[PDB]
From Swiss-Prot, chains A, B, C, D, E, F, G, H, I, J:
Highly expressed in presynaptic terminals in the central nervous system. Expressed principally in brain. It is linked to Genetic alterations of SNCA resulting in aberrant polymerization into fibrils, are associated with several neurodegenerative diseases (synucleinopathies). SNCA fibrillar aggregates represent the major non A-beta component of Alzheimer disease amyloid plaque, and a major component of Lewy body inclusions. They are also found within Lewy body (LB)-like intraneuronal inclusions, glial inclusions and axonal spheroids in neurodegeneration with brain iron accumulation type 1. The 'non A-beta component of Alzheimer disease amyloid plaque' domain (NAC domain) is involved in fibrils formation. The middle hydrophobic region forms the core of the filaments. The C-terminus may regulate aggregation and determine the diameter of the filaments. Soluble monomer. Homotetramer. A dynamic intracellular population of tetramers and monomers coexists normally and the tetramer plays an essential role in maintaining homeostasis. Interacts with UCHL1. Interacts with phospholipase D and histones. Interacts (via N-terminus) with synphilin-1/SNCAIP; this interaction promotes formation of SNCA inclusions in the cytoplasm. Interacts with CALM1. Interacts with STXBP1; this interaction controls SNCA self-replicating aggregation. Interacts with SNARE components VAMP2 and SNAP25; these interactions allows SNARE complex assembly and integrity. Neuronal protein that plays several roles in synaptic activity such as regulation of synaptic vesicle trafficking and subsequent neurotransmitter release. Participates as a monomer in synaptic vesicle exocytosis by enhancing vesicle priming, fusion and dilation of exocytotic fusion pores. Mechanistically, acts by increasing local Ca(2+) release from microdomains which is essential for the enhancement of ATP-induced exocytosis. The chain holds residues 69 to 77 of 140 of the full protein. This is Alpha-synuclein. Phosphorylated, predominantly on serine residues. Phosphorylation by CK1 appears to occur on residues distinct from the residue phosphorylated by other kinases. Hallmark lesions of neurodegenerative synucleinopathies contain alpha-synuclein that is modified by nitration of tyrosine residues and possibly by dityrosine cross-linking to generated stable oligomers. Signal peptide: none annotated. The gene is SNCA. It comes from the Eukaryota. The lineage of its organism: Eukaryota, Metazoa, Chordata, Craniata, Vertebrata.
Length: 9, 9, 9, 9, 9, 9, 9, 9, 9, 9
């Protein structure tokens, strides 16, 4: 699995 | 700002 | 700012 | 598994 | 600022 | 596993 | 600032 | 496993 | 500033 | 295992 999470302000 | 990031496998 | 990052396997 | 988490302000 | 980072396997 | 976590302000 | 980093296997 | 955690202000 | 870093295997 | 933790202000 390739799992990528980005959270930005 | 409240910024919350969760990345899980 | 409250900034919280969690990365888990 | 490749797991990548980014949390930014 | 309160900045909290957790990286776990 | 390759696990990478970045938390930034 | 309160800055907290945890990296674990 | 390669586990990398970065927490920055 | 309160700065706390934990790296564990 | 290669485990790398960086906490910075």
């Amino acid at each position: 699995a390739v799992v990528t999470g980005v959270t930005a302000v």
